[PDB]
Design an enzyme around this catalytic site. Structure first.
Site, PDB file in Angstrom:
ATOM      1  N   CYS A   2      30.834  35.188  36.238  1.00  0.00           N
ATOM      2  CA  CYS A   2      32.351  34.891  35.901  1.00  0.00           C
ATOM      3  C   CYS A   2      32.748  33.916  36.893  1.00  0.00           C
ATOM      4  O   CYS A   2      32.399  33.720  38.157  1.00  0.00           O
ATOM      5  CB  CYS A   2      33.322  35.971  35.883  1.00  0.00           C
ATOM      6  N   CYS A  21      38.612  37.431  36.924  1.00  0.00           N
ATOM      7  CA  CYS A  21      38.584  36.052  36.400  1.00  0.00           C
ATOM      8  C   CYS A  21      39.572  35.934  35.444  1.00  0.00           C
ATOM      9  O   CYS A  21      40.429  37.066  35.313  1.00  0.00           O
ATOM     10  CB  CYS A  21      37.341  36.012  35.682  1.00  0.00           C
ATOM     11  N   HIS A  26      38.446  42.425  38.222  1.00  0.00           N
ATOM     12  CA  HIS A  26      36.815  42.901  38.351  1.00  0.00           C
ATOM     13  C   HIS A  26      36.935  44.041  39.352  1.00  0.00           C
ATOM     14  O   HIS A  26      36.468  45.060  39.181  1.00  0.00           O
ATOM     15  CB  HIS A  26      35.924  41.991  38.783  1.00  0.00           C
ATOM     16  N   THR A  78      29.782  56.322  31.626  1.00  0.00           N
ATOM     17  CA  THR A  78      30.500  55.718  32.920  1.00  0.00           C
ATOM     18  C   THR A  78      31.851  54.725  32.343  1.00  0.00           C
ATOM     19  O   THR A  78      32.833  55.347  33.109  1.00  0.00           O
ATOM     20  CB  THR A  78      29.364  54.715  33.885  1.00  0.00           C
ATOM     21  N   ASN A 106      30.760  64.535  27.299  1.00  0.00           N
ATOM     22  CA  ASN A 106      29.388  65.094  27.702  1.00  0.00           C
ATOM     23  C   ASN A 106      30.042  66.342  28.824  1.00  0.00           C
ATOM     24  O   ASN A 106      29.870  66.453  29.610  1.00  0.00           O
ATOM     25  CB  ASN A 106      28.813  64.236  28.787  1.00  0.00           C
ATOM     26  N   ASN A 120      33.709  53.359  40.594  1.00  0.00           N
ATOM     27  CA  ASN A 120      34.749  53.075  39.993  1.00  0.00           C
ATOM     28  C   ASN A 120      35.193  51.802  40.810  1.00  0.00           C
ATOM     29  O   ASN A 120      35.184  51.732  41.965  1.00  0.00           O
ATOM     30  CB  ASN A 120      36.203  53.799  40.069  1.00  0.00           C
ATOM     31  N   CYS A 128      40.826  57.542  40.386  1.00  0.00           N
ATOM     32  CA  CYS A 128      39.698  58.634  40.678  1.00  0.00           C
ATOM     33  C   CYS A 128      40.102  59.758  41.597  1.00  0.00           C
ATOM     34  O   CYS A 128      39.597  60.799  41.865  1.00  0.00           O
ATOM     35  CB  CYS A 128      38.345  57.865  41.267  1.00  0.00           C
TER      36      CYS A 128
HETATM   37 ZN   LIG Z   1      34.939  38.676  34.462  1.00  0.00          ZN
END
Ligand SMILES: [Zn+2]
Length: 162
Positions: A2, A21, A26, A78, A106, A120, A128
């Site tokens: 990215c 991005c 991110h 995840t 789960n 994370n 979290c």
């Molecule tokens: Zn990206």
């Protein structure tokens, strides 16, 4: 792969570096052309975190930025853990690791939930710190216990400490 931009902000927890991005935020990292108010993910992320810390009563009013870390780009347990936590666990609430495991598909996979949380890439935004061991046991934090307890205190939770 990215095309990444970054911005920094001050916070009570020290400096935070945002990277993202055009497709989304991110990462939010604790370090210890765009104008604020704009639709760009980095700008929405900036606005959200500043409201989180300085106008928490308005937090639900602020757009959650699109997320584009690779962990969000493909289906996985995840990803389910992170997305369900973000979708479900509100400012001022907590959920146990075991109930989050079940939520994410789960039951009983508490250790895998802990691993997902440690990975994370956008802490605070994906909360979290609101995942705890049990009713009287705040549990651990990738960012350190004092930070977890401080955030819960900021949100007025019983398990908060500062
Ligand atoms: Zn990206």
């Amino acid at each position: 792969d990215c095309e990444m931009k970054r911005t920094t902000l001050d916070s009570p927890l020290g400096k935070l570096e945002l990277s993202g991005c055009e497709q989304g935020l991110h990462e939010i990292i604790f370090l210890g052309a765009a104008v604020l108010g704009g639709p760009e993910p980095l700008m929405q992320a900036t606005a959200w975190l500043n409201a989180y810390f300085h106008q928490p009563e308005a937090i639900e009013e602020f757009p959650v930025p699109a997320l584009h870390h690779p962990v969000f780009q493909q289906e996985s347990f995840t990803r389910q853990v992170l997305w369900k936590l973000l979708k479900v666990v509100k400012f001022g609430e907590v959920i146990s690791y075991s109930h989050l495991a079940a939520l994410a598909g789960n039951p009983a996979a508490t250790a895998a939930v802990k691993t997902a949380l440690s990975g994370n890439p956008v802490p605070i935004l994906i909360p979290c710190h609101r995942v705890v061991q049990g009713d009287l046991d705040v549990g651990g934090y990738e960012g350190g216990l004092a930070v977890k307890e401080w955030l819960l205190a900021h949100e007025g939770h019983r398990l908060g400490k500062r």
